[PDB]
């Protein structure tokens, strides 16, 4: 049995990052909170500043602690940036090919082909367009250019696969992607 | 410092509908979801629903889907649940709460609009 | 579905005590797990989230642990505002649950 193949799409190797700087309200950022000017697509030039400004990721801020004990002088409620996004270090890619109709030579099963060791495997993947939470293709990517650094523009996803959760002085990422490489030796 | 505000409580009929409203200030409204616990008088505390930071993903608790909205309003930083066909148990009171992912703890609370509903 | 038991549903402990409330999964939930403080007719505060991570600002005093299906907070010393209603709460899959809770009363 053969898998009758639709159109396929790329999935990176996707592994969860986030940043945050706190600055005061004296600043020039900060004025009675969060400027509306910051967005899920906006960045900080003060953050850990290696950050892809091209790839898929989220942003935003909120109100930290602010008094004569967190950094800021005057007693003054500051402001805290933070960037959670997803980043391929290894350059991996799966690409990924649902599966149509089964012919003769268990739905919605997908070949998942590795593409420099070209290793084959089948698993449950999400249908072309759809950044489904749980299964292969959370994040899908259009083109093996796309994939190979989660481009912002080939590639799509929910951010909400990623959490992140504040602390005072840095912040605490969250994963919840579904590994290809945890789906895809079992049944190698 | 980070706020959300509700109103819009009230008494309404066994079967009617109301509108509980929560606006929020001190963060990026659109990065974050919001989430419904509501809690009926001296009982715990119970999960209502939630939306995502774009509006996409609602989740409901298996007690009200079926029967109540969430919804959000990018421009007047507010979050609003609708409660239709409401019943008499319904009655409690409704805190918003911020919670960054859609699946996150929630962190910081509202101070509850209550809603009770009689015949 | 899953569902969070909390025991003992209330306890009667006095200043000074240290206090144990356990919250219990009937399915794995992972780390995601959350503790709040909510005294009478009042928002409740988050004290845990990650189950481990103590909220920011929340006093020192108070540590979580646990994972799967088992989860204690834990108060070293109850200092006298400790007293209020305490709920854990699961978000590793929807829908969200909470305990029932446990009323931490005065012993005389």
């Known amino acids: 049995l053969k898998c009758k193949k639709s159109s396929s799409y790329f999935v990176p190797d996707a592994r969860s990052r986030c940043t945050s700087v706190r600055r005061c309200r004296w600043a020039g950022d900060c004025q009675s909170g969060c400027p509306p000017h910051f967005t899920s697509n906006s960045f900080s030039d003060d953050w850990a500043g290696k950050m892809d400004r091209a790839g898929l990721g989220f942003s935003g801020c909120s109100d930290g602690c602010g008094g004569a004990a967190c950094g800021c002088f005057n007693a003054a409620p500051s402001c805290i940036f933070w960037r959670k996004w997803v980043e391929n270090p290894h350059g991996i890619i799966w690409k990924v090919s649902p599966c149509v109709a089964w012919v003769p030579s268990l739905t919605d099963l997908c070949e998942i082909e590795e593409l420099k060791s070209k290793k084959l495997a089948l698993a449950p993947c999400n249908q072309a367009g759809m950044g489904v939470v749980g299964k292969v293709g959370e994040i899908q990517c259009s083109s093996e250019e796309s994939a190979r650094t989660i481009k912002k523009d080939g590639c799509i996803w929910n951010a909400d696969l990623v959490g992140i959760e504040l602390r005072v002085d840095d912040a605490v990422c969250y994963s919840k992607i579904t590994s290809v490489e945890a789906v895809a030796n079992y049944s190698a | 410092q980070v706020q959300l505000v509700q109103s819009g409580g009230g008494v309404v009929k066994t079967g009617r509908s109301q509108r509980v409203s929560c606006a929020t200030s001190?963060?990026?409204?659109?990065?974050?979801?919001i989430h419904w616990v509501r809690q009926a008088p001296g009982k715990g505390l119970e999960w209502v629903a939630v939306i995502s930071y774009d509006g996409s993903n609602k989740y409901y608790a298996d007690s009200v889907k079926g029967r109540f909205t969430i919804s959000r309003d990018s421009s007047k930083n507010t979050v609003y649940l609708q409660m239709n066909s409401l019943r008499t148990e319904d009655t409690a009171v409704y805190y918003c709460?911020?919670?960054?992912?859609?699946?996150?703890?929630?962190?910081?609370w509202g101070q509850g609009t209550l809603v009770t509903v009689s015949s | 579905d899953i569902q969070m038991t909390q025991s003992p549903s209330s306890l009667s402990a006095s200043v000074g005590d240290r206090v144990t409330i356990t919250c219990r999964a009937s399915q794995g939930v992972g780390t995601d797990l959350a503790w709040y403080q909510q005294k009478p007719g009042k928002a409740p505060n988050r004290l845990i989230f990650?189950?481990?991570n103590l909220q920011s600002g929340v006093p020192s005093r108070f540590s979580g642990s646990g994972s799967g299906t088992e989860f204690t907070l834990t108060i070293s010393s109850l200092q006298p505002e400790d007293f209020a209603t305490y709920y854990c709460?699961?978000?590793?899959?929807?829908?969200?649950?909470f305990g029932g809770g446990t009323k931490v009363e005065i012993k005389r």
């Open positions: 001190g963060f990026t409204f659109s990065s974050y979801a």
């Open positions: 990650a189950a481990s």
């Open positions: 709460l699961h978000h590793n899959s929807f829908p969200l649950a």
């Open positions: 709460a911020r919670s960054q992912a859609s699946w996150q703890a929630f962190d910081y």
